[PDB]
Design a protein around this nucleic acid. Sequence first.
RNA 1: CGACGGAAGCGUCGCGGUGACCGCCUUGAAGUACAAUUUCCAUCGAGCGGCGGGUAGAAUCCUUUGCAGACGACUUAAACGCGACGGGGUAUUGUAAGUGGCAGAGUGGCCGCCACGAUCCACUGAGAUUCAGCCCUUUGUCGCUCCGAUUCGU
RNA 2: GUCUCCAAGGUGAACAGCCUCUGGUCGAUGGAACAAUGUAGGCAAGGGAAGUCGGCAAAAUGGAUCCGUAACUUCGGGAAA
RNA 3: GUAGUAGCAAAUAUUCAAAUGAGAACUUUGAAGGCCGAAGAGGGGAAAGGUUCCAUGUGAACGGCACUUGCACAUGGGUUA
Lengths: 386, 110
Amino acid sequence: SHRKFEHPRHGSLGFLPRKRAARHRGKVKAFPKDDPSKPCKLTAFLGYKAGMTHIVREVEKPGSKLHKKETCEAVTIVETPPMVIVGVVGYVKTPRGLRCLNTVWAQHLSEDIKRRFYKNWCKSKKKAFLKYSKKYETDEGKKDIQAQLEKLKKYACVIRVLAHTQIRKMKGLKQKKAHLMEIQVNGGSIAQKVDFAYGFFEKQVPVDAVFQKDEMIDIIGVTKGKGYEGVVTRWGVTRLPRKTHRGLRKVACIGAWHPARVSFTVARAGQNGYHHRTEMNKKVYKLGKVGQESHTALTEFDRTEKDITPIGGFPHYGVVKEDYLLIKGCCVGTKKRVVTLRQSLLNQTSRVALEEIKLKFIDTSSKFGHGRFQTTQEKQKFYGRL
Amino acid sequence: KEEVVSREYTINLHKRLHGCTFKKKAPTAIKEIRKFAQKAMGTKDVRVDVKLNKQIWSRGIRSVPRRVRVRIARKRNDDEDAKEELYSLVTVAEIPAEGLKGLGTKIIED
RNA sequence: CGACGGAAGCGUCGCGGUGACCGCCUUGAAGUACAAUUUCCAUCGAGCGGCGGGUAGAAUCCUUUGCAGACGACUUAAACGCGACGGGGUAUUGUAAGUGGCAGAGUGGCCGCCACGAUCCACUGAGAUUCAGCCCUUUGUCGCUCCGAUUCGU
RNA sequence: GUCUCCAAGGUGAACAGCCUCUGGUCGAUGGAACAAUGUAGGCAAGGGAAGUCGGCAAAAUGGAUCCGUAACUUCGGGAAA
RNA sequence: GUAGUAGCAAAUAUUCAAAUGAGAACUUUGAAGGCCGAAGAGGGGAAAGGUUCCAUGUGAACGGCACUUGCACAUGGGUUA
Ligand SMILES: [K+]
Ligand SMILES: [K+]
Ligand SMILES: [K+]
Ligand SMILES: [K+]
Ligand SMILES: [K+]
Ligand SMILES: [K+]
Ligand SMILES: [K+]
Ligand SMILES: [K+]
Ligand SMILES: [K+]
Ligand SMILES: [Mg+2]
Ligand SMILES: [Mg+2]
Ligand SMILES: [Mg+2]
Ligand SMILES: [Mg+2]
Ligand SMILES: [Mg+2]
Ligand SMILES: [Mg+2]
Ligand SMILES: [Mg+2]
Ligand SMILES: [Mg+2]
Ligand SMILES: [Mg+2]
Ligand SMILES: [Mg+2]
Ligand SMILES: [Mg+2]
Ligand SMILES: [Mg+2]
Ligand SMILES: [Mg+2]
Ligand SMILES: [Mg+2]
Ligand SMILES: [Mg+2]
Ligand SMILES: [Mg+2]
Ligand SMILES: [Mg+2]
Ligand SMILES: [Mg+2]
Ligand SMILES: [Mg+2]
Ligand SMILES: [Mg+2]
Ligand SMILES: [Mg+2]
Ligand SMILES: [Mg+2]
Ligand SMILES: [Mg+2]
Ligand SMILES: [Mg+2]
Ligand SMILES: [Mg+2]
Ligand SMILES: [Mg+2]
Ligand SMILES: [Mg+2]
Ligand SMILES: [Mg+2]
């Protein structure tokens, strides 16, 4: 018989299976559509989640209750030191999808990236790319390298650069093995893309070259892990009455008599968290460039001299010293987790997307408690230098 | 370097016993000290002096001291067909007047 | 060798070298006695004995980490950094113990002194605790830097 | 499940509960982890029975001293109202 | 077959050193930390049991892990009106 009363089902069937992701680094499932008329430009960037804080800004939203008023909104700090281009890869459009044609690497590869090719770097002989690097040392070898590049210019339809992070510059991560990914190049002709990619071999690409302030971006990563979990927490099914024999944190009926099988739409206990997710429309409130006033937490209204890092350091992360992005809202994953930043696939035309951000105050009090001092000097002056 | 060596350590039992069950807290402190000696001396055979055991249990089974100053003396075992050539003896150590402030690891002379 | 071919190109074409067929010539076929698979090809795969050239690594267990975790698995680390203390930063509580007081409701002795007294004040936003899954780190102290084990080949 | 004798100190009305002395005893197979579900014990913003057959369960009340105590009543009670 | 699976989880709790032994988380001594808390996990007796009492020793089995251990096994001793 029909169910007595109607309510929507618990959970989404579009995020199945709820298994552990087969990767730790966020994978870009789709890159922005390529517009040849635009200059060559990267479409993605890697970063590390440092922590969260809140900011205050004066809203400019005509017709809104908040117009010319102040609002406090949470932000996430993503430390984004420049990436290093170490190779280029070209794909050919075939009836069976894109097929990788060839991969060309730079002559010199850092130790941090070479660690990515080993399970035990210290115990190994460190032979990776040693023979490959030698053909850059001979005229005949150089001709072969150039020939491979010309082959990409002739047949490749999609060009992606091999870029890795400088993870050594963030000592808080306690990791020396850098993260490598393919970043697609959009704009210009195929020849320009290859020339654009080859020109950056062994060079650094700052985050500012990919993203900017006030634009919407997509954040990709793996959510926080939580292990084996029951249906109530995993799927959000309501608890059973107090007097239920054999427990109340369950789904009462997991299926009708027919079909004589448990369906895949029924909530079941299992892995919760550590799932791959792609979240859209995260606005960039601030881009901090090292060596510039933008790197500090100063604002046109608050002239207190202070850094982005709260006193005592970002919990479980450390001190942010490299380029960083201030992103509205929350970011997937734990502290220190590598996150993938991607340009929006949609055309940003809403007023929120085009809104010009103007921060008034950035909170730098300690996040390891009920912090009430924005700077260490303020705290010391409070206690008579303590 | 030298098989026979003695040093004084300050063991932070508070962080090693964090979140431990009350009925196993003091017993777990003995295991943690035994593990600490093995890493600091590399000898599986670790012997705990009864005085040190008394200090660990001085405040009952729950409240183990937050920090304890101990002396670990690695020495040769001279018994017929000993399972191991060396062993470590952990005993209580005196605390200076200032306490455990600014007190690092110290090597005890002959 | 040269050029071309990227949809799975692994092929096509040109030049040179070389064999066969063909051309000419010579010679033979049988008694294999009336048929008995017309064994002989290329598709890789090879397994071996020799003759040349080429190459001189990884994975896993043990340990470590907690961005992970029921167990497996997963993310890290393994001659310089790591590890153990300590210091600083940060945070929680709310002002430690000791000393002194012409503070203290009062009370008991002696000839103001002595004794008792919860509490109060000063030293004292003091003391205690602070990664165990917080941050920085020799001003300073100390240790360890790898005995091994199991496998894997076009 | 199975009759009975002896019975310390403190707190307190109390061979109540809680702690201790004499005497007895650590006998319940151990080790490492800290998932779901469970069993036992807890707590919780704002609302306060809307839950459920039903306030089931839990919470709240609780000792002592002083004041004060209605309907009704078989005049005794009700009453620790 | 199920299956080396269900299962060993009430009665707060063990730790250190040494001795003995082929072998010790489980025996003994000492030290420490806990519990029973006198209507006891203490000290006796009536029923009922019948040698379980004591000493020494011990291959196996048994004491649902283990045991050098013993209310097990073997030998001997022990109850006076
Ligand atoms: K129904
Ligand atoms: K939720
Ligand atoms: K419910
Ligand atoms: K004081
Ligand atoms: K004070
Ligand atoms: K549980
Ligand atoms: K109700
Ligand atoms: K009897
Ligand atoms: K008689
Ligand atoms: Mg319906
Ligand atoms: Mg897709
Ligand atoms: Mg977790
Ligand atoms: Mg029931
Ligand atoms: Mg916080
Ligand atoms: Mg410290
Ligand atoms: Mg750590
Ligand atoms: Mg009394
Ligand atoms: Mg009593
Ligand atoms: Mg409530
Ligand atoms: Mg409330
Ligand atoms: Mg109410
Ligand atoms: Mg109702
Ligand atoms: Mg209802
Ligand atoms: Mg009803
Ligand atoms: Mg009830
Ligand atoms: Mg009434
Ligand atoms: Mg089992
Ligand atoms: Mg059971
Ligand atoms: Mg157990
Ligand atoms: Mg028990
Ligand atoms: Mg026992
Ligand atoms: Mg009790
Ligand atoms: Mg007691
Ligand atoms: Mg009695
Ligand atoms: Mg047995
Ligand atoms: Mg006996
Ligand atoms: Mg017998």
